[PDB]
């Protein structure tokens, strides 16, 4: 039986479920409230500069999942790109994550790796028996100068919270690498789509069995015209925020164009509270195989997600999870729908993890047909 599917969202979740289902002969209808596909992974070429701009902030592709890597290479030319981050703080510029250079530079030293391990040990705060706080976990690990330089002000700006208000759980391991490797990400596969994520997702959507409708908001009544709905929209929004809004940080991006080269790297973090933006991204650096005279940059600002804002980073502490549980027990009562994705499940997910879950979701749904069985509302655990 060729099933009639509605998908709410044209991001990775929607596109990847859609395409898997379309290929098995189902009639997939994808809608998006935005005037463009891609969801938050969307990029577009600035008309004045011709720079590929990542519209909703830097998107760097990285995965240890070979299946997912193979999948993206089917839909794009993946360019070798290894993300490297600088941070400005204390009137100095450092490598991130904290590594041997960061240390040697920070302390005006020349430590070998083993010498640096001793320094971090004799810099770690030897007091709080059982650290209960992110502040004290950090202090135990790296000590005061580094906690303050690299962690304190960044948390306050990014989360609108004191690190003393967060649990020790946030920092499981010593955040230092005892060599000169300055790759930000440890993933096996790391690349950048030559022609961008939007072209990649356009290719993913490129199937006879998929109809895309843009500038179209979901309306609950439509539900009855379909065999099943896959919903990648905000879970609380689906229920009209009847219990209250789920906690999110929003981001404002202030766009500006520079002639030449504004910062000389893709991403520069500003760890200080004395800098109101959190980082500056210079988009042309995500495409090193291109040359651009002009440069589009974003100053990035973190903020509480008020009602009109794009939700970005989920807060997810005790009271948020408490409020989620209310939606979850409404949702787990629903009959012909599956909530997926960063918003439908209130988790932060990377692109590769999105595609992974999206492939599995479709696999689960397809199986449920052959084996004539009910399709679950969640294919991944949410609590
Ligand atoms: C600031 C930031 C930076 C990121 N950078 C990286 C990175 O560098 N590397 C990485 O791996 N991942 C990155 N990500 C994660 C990446 O953005 C997500 O994995 C990806 O967006 C997941 O897409 P999705 O399809 O699951 O959901 P989304 O991309 O949010 O797509 C959902 C779509 O649904 C639409 N929609 C919602 N509600 C409705 C409705 N009611 N009706 C119609 N349409 C609706 C929205 O318009 C949207 O287009 C980043 C995330 C953030 C917040």
Swiss-Prot record:
Cofactor(s) the record lists: FAD
Keyword set includes RNA-binding: no
EC number: 5.4.99.9
InterPro entries in UniProt: UDP-GALP_mutase, UDP-GalPyranose_mutase_C
Binding site for FAD: 13, 32-33, 40, 59-60, 218, 342, 349-354
Record-linked SUPFAM superfamilies: FAD-linked reductases, C-terminal domain (SSF54373), Nucleotide-binding domain (SSF51971)
A GO term from the CC aspect: cytosol
Coiled coil, from the record: none
Residue positions binding UDP-alpha-D-galactose: 83, 150, 155, 159, 184, 269, 279, 313, 348
Record-linked NCBIfam families: UDP-GALP_mutase
Stated role: Involved in the biosynthesis of the galactose-containing O-side-chain polysaccharide backbone structure of D-galactan I which is a key component of lipopolysaccharide (LPS). Catalyzes the interconversion through a 2-keto intermediate of uridine diphosphogalactopyranose (UDP-GalP) into uridine diphosphogalactofuranose (UDP-GalF) which is the biosynthetic precursor of galactofuranosyl residues.
Stated family: Belongs to the UDP-galactopyranose/dTDP-fucopyranose mutase family.
Protein name: UDP-galactopyranose mutase
Organism this protein belongs to: Klebsiella pneumoniae
UniProt gene name: rfbD
